[PDB]
């Protein structure tokens, strides 16, 4: 049944101006993607955790363009979030498992 399909660190960026934000950790399960963020604050190390159901999550391959390299984007109302993988291999894997687990979700319903 349920299991951990894939996980790893990513660096988030603001989509419109491509400004670097913070490191986050992604955990892919068989029907949703969990993104855990840790935003340091003066005296309240804030943490933003978001869960994205694969049957609602749009995953976009952001084509390489200098201010951008090895990134992909997640779109789910009301968010648009860009993430950078450590290298091209990691990006390829994320996109492959995201697509395959979504595919499996389909031939499961």
């Amino acid at each position: 049944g349920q299991y951990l399909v894939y996980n790893g660190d990513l660096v988030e960026y603001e989509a419109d101006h491509m400004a670097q934000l913070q490191r986050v950790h992604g955990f892919l399960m068989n029907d949703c993607l969990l993104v855990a963020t840790w935003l340091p604050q003066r005296r309240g190390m804030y943490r933003y955790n978001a869960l994205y159901p694969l049957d609602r999550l749009a995953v976009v391959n952001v084509k390489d363009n200098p201010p951008m390299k090895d990134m992909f984007k997640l779109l789910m109302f009301p968010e648009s979030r860009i993430f950078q993988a450590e290298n091209a291999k990691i990006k390829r894997e994320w996109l492959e498992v995201l697509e395959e687990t979504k595919r499996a979700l389909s031939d499961k319903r």
Partner: protein, 173 residues
């Protein structure tokens, strides 16, 4: 800061959404079909004296989940509704694409251009120019025929869409 115009390619499978995008972005065109999932492109251009950036979301003509499709559409500011002049069913499909877009955007005047691609294949035309123009006029939008192959009107559709997007922004502010 450079403005950013978000364009969304919409249309049935095979109409040439990716080809139009790639011709505009890189001046390239290939004959082999390559089913798209979802790709994002960005390019710096000069729009009427201003250095701006255009962002193009190119996705598959068919998406299994309506919620996912809506998320694609919702991220956009303007749309190139593409159909192939050689396939009447792609032309028929535009009505629903438009309905889905108006709903998600909740705006009747959403920047939108009806695009008849593959104009170089005139000998195989299934959709007449009049049909398309008439449909476009009733939707209160412009119609343009393009050829991702010969570049005919390729820059024109993206730049015309950018100007409509820029227009809405000028007033809505």
């Amino acid at each position: 800061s450079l403005a950013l115009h978000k364009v969304i390619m919409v249309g049935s499978g095979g109409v040439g959404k990716s080809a139009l995008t790639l011709q505009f972005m890189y001046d390239e065109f290939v004959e082999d079909y390559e089913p798209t999932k979802a790709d994002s492109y960005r390019k710096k251009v000069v729009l009427d004296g201003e250095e701006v950036q255009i962002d193009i979301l190119d996705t598959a003509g068919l998406e299994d989940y309506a919620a996912i499709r809506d998320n694609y559409f919702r991220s956009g500011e303007g749309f190139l509704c593409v159909f192939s002049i050689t396939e009447m069913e792609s032309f028929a499909a535009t009505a629903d694409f438009r309905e889905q877009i108006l709903r998600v955007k909740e705006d009747e005047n959403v920047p939108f251009l009806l695009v008849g691609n593959k104009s170089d294949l005139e000998d195989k035309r299934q959709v007449s120019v009049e049909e398309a123009k008439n449909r476009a006029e009733q939707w209160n939008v412009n119609y343009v025929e393009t050829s991702a192959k010969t570049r005919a009107n390729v820059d024109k559709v993206f730049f015309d869409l950018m100007r409509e997007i820029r227009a809405r922004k000028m007033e809505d502010s």
